[PDB]
Structures are given as C-alpha cells and as structure tokens.
Design a protein around this ligand. Sequence first.
Ligand code: HEM
Length: 153
Amino acid sequence: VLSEGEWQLVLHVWAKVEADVAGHGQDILIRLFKSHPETLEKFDRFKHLKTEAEMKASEDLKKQGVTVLTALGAILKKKGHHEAELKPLAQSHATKHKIPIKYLEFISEAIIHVLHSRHPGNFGADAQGAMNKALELFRKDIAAKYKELGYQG
Ligand code: HEM
C-alpha cells in the first residue's frame, strides 16, 4: 500500500507527462521495443516497423502510446482503488493480446527510464521509488486478475 505522499510523487511527475502524452508515449514504446524487441511482435498493427525512425513516423504507434499512457494515468489517479479499471484491461491483455507479466515488467522499466531522462526535476530517487511502488502494485493486481481469468502471466 502506497502512502498519500508516495501517490503525490507519482501524480506530480504524471502531470508533466500530460503536457504531451503523445511524445512521452512514443519515447516509452520505442524504448520498450529497443530494449526488448520481442515485445514488438505482440502488436500486429505495427510489428513490421524496422527502425526507430519508422517508429517515430508511425501515426498508429503514436496513437497506441496515447492509449497506453492515458489508461495507465487513469489507474494511477485511482491511487490503488483501480479494481474497475483493471477488469477490462486484464481481460484483453490476458486473453486477446496474450501479454505476459514479464512484458508488463518490461514496459514498467521503459516508463521509469523515460521519466528519469525527461523529468529530473520531478523524478529524483524518492519519486522514482514511488513510481516503482505504484507500478509494482499495478502488476501485482493485474497478475492476480490474470490468474482469475485462467492465464498464467
Ligand atoms: C502499463 C501497461 C499497459 C497498459 C495500461 C495498456 C493499455 C492498453 C489499452 C488501453 C489498450 C486498448 C484497449 C485494450 O485492448 O485493452 C491496449 C491494447 C493493446 N495492448 Fe496494451 N497496455 C499495457 C501494456 C502492454 C504491453 C507491455 C504490451 C505488449 C508487449 C501490450 C500489448 C497490447 C496490444 C497488442 C494491444 C492491441 C493493439 C492494437 O489495437 O493493435 N500492452 N493496451
């Protein structure tokens, strides 16, 4: 369970993401695909992209980055009270997209990497620890839902 002070560190860096969620989403997805290229294979819409340049020019990838980060932002703003938000997300990602917990760890690592690079003014050590806690809680609750849904993540 996160403290309110930890939630505020999470929400204060998310406020900067929201200055330009599209640009942050491009950076985060591209970082994920460069660090863990196997994850790109899950996105049938744009798994054909070969280079970071193609990735940056992809309108579909940009829209996906907005979709991801906006859904995650809604979850974070619930400050752990995210049962309703996790239901459809767990179901689609367990059953339709088939995203292992290991890949949610990968995208969490990409989010932390991009925030560390872009936002040193709001992502010092304490803030990064709070974000890690929030993302661990997200993955913990998602993994429990995966099991309820019949998916070993
Ligand atoms: C913070 C973690 C994540 C969040 C909040 C998130 C959120 C979403 C949302 C809102 C959608 C659209 C609605 C839906 O299908 O449920 C979506 C679609 C999708 N997600 Fe995720 N996602 C996350 C992580 C991942 C990861 C790590 C992968 C793959 C490695 C992935 C693969 C996909 C795919 C393939 C789609 C369908 C894209 C398409 O329409 O072609 N997701 N995600």
